[PDB]
Amino acid sequence: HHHHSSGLVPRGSHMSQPSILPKPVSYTVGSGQFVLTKNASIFVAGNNVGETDELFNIGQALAKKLNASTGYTISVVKSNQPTAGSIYLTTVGGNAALGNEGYDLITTSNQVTLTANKPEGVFRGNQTLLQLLPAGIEKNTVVSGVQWVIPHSNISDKPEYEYRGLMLDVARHFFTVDEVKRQIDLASQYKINKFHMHLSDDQGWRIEIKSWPDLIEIGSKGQVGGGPGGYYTQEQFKDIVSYAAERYIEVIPEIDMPGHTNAALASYGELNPDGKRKAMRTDTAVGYSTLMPRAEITYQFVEDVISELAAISPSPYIHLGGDESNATSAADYDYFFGRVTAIANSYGKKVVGWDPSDTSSGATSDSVLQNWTCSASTGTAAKAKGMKVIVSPANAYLDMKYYSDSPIGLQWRGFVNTNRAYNWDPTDCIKGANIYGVESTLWTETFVTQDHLDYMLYPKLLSNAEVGWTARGDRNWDDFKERLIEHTPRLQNKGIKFFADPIV
């Protein structure tokens, strides 16, 4: 047999017909179609009234989306007796083998029926349902001239990995609450279920801490390259968390320590050995900053921050960073990371940290490693301790240039095009681990606008999303590439300023 790898498409990028991404466990099509008309309702039915009420909210979110493009006013009914032409969302009789996020989705001429185990799984299945309707459905304004049809079809589905996440760096360049919500919204449509916010770094501190007000008054006032910066009040952070929750997305806030801490060091002189504030930094260096690992003030500061953040962050996890502490000795890092893990745990939060944070003797088997290095020895400690691992290899570093000539992005992990973002498996990063799942990271040294975010995340994030959801035996670049071409009008329809990658 003969085999080949993909080159660029001759003559440039390529960027009744459902476009399902990530690819579901199974999808068959039969004869006939359902027609969504102006008289359609969404019926919801759970195993008790409280579950029905949660399904009702999910139905209303679906209706709002459908109404925007169809110009209809589809309403939601609490009943297990849907009428011909109805969409029906239920958790009564879910197939347990499909888990919390899994669902069956069967479309007949008279009815769309989504059957899941939990409300969360109906939310995920609704993302597939939007992809079964014609391109045009994902428009934010009324589309005319398109019959709203869904082919007679049968889908069953469930994720391969539990953790399928996106990190946004809001420290290097700040993005508004609206801009963050939009990225969360877009990601949710591809079954991303986790959002990691990198809220502090050398060039900016982005979360209001009432007990340490100069973190904002001084530390939020810049960004890479110099510029106004910005921050989230605690109310604005709660608003983000709530918006994410409606999409069954967990938000994990990161306060990076003991390195990548210049913004805090520039806000409070008492955090520095000489008692003086650092100057704020707008460059892109490079592992130089450290908290004082042997000063009690450091741990008082960390505790105040953790206390305030824990009070407003319902996720059982807090991310404490731990990357590139090059100005911290190995002994002091071990010590520091163990102490701050104990503080976090005292506030009822489990700690996620970048490698090498798993090597801290203060870590517990409840701590999580985010493995970005992905070398042979990375996560030896995590594995030995029974710690779950989230992988973020080069293939998930979405801030890398697509190509040598990309007008934005970095290149310290090489180039990451749409193909590279697809052709990998979490087991490539680490062997012998409990892999919790995958996280796409979008660092923002070089991204200043929403259009920059769109360009790098789309289509790359779609590749990573499939690696998290679709089983490896069912993944194939040639298949995905052709599906991505078909999906293009949908990206356009959503207003995504994607890069038309010439490898697609």
Ligand X SMILES: CC(=O)N[C@H]1CN2CC[C@H](O)[C@@H]2[C@@H](O)[C@@H]1O
Q: Which residues are catalytic?
A: 324
Q: Contact with ligand X (CB under 6 A): which of 231, 301, 436, 443?
A: 443
Residue nearer to ligand X on the CB measure, 337 or 354: 354
Give how many residues touch ligand X by CB under 6 A.
Answer: 8
Q: Does 373 bind ligand X (CB under 6 A)?
A: no
Which backbone phi and psi does 170 adopt, to 5 degrees? -105, 5
CB of 280 to ligand X, least distance (A): 17
Print the binding letters for residues 90-119 with ligand X: x by CB under 6 A, - otherwise: ------------------------------
CB of 408 to ligand X, least distance (A): 13
- Interface of this chain with ligand X, residues 403 to 422, rule: CB under 6 A: 412
Alpha carbon distance 223, 228 (integer Å): 7
Residue nearer to ligand X on the CB measure, 43 or 443: 443
Helix (H) or strand (E) holding 124, with range, is helix 119-132
- Interface of this chain with ligand X, residues 202 to 241, rule: CB under 6 A: none
- Say if CB 263 and CB 171 are below 8 A apart: yes
Residue nearer to ligand X on the CB measure, 392 or 463: 392
Q: Does 324 bind ligand X (CB under 6 A)?
A: yes
Check the CA dihedral 438-444-446-451 and report its sign: positive
How many CB atoms are closer than 10 A to CB 297?
12
How many CB atoms are closer than 10 A to CB 381?
19
Q: What's the per-residue H, E or C state across 225-254?
A: CCCCCCCECHHHHHHHHHHHHCCCCEEEEE
Alpha carbon distance 179, 449 (integer Å): 9
Q: Does 81 bind ligand X (CB under 6 A)?
A: no
Q: Contact with ligand X (CB under 6 A): which of 195, 336, 354, 458?
A: 354
CB of 442 to ligand X, least distance (A): 10
Q: Which residue has the tokens 């090498």?
A: 356
Residue nearer to ligand X on the CB measure, 190 or 372: 372
Q: Which of 251, 337, 253, 220 is nearest to 290 (CA)?
A: 337
Alpha carbon distance 413, 429 (integer Å): 14
Q: Contact with ligand X (CB under 6 A): which of 179, 323, 366, 425?
A: 323
Q: Does 179 bind ligand X (CB under 6 A)?
A: no
What are 168's two structure tokens? 């946004």
CB of 456 to ligand X, least distance (A): 13
Residue nearer to ligand X on the CB measure, 198 or 247: 198
Alpha carbon distance 147, 69 (integer Å): 12
Residue nearer to ligand X on the CB measure, 173 or 221: 173
- Say if CB 17 and CB 64 are below 8 A apart: no
Alpha carbon distance 144, 146 (integer Å): 6
Residue nearer to ligand X on the CB measure, 324 or 486: 324
Q: Contact with ligand X (CB under 6 A): which of 308, 445, 454, 501?
A: 445
CB of 375 to ligand X, least distance (A): 14
CB of 400 to ligand X, least distance (A): 10
Return all residues near 371 (Cβ < 8 A) that are at least 6 apart.
Answer: 355, 378, 379, 382, 389, 390, 391, 392, 393, 429, 430, 433
Q: Does 284 bind ligand X (CB under 6 A)?
A: yes
Q: Contact with ligand X (CB under 6 A): which of 34, 372, 447, 499?
A: 372
- Residues binding ligand X (CB under 6 A): 284, 323-324, 354, 372, 412, 443, 445
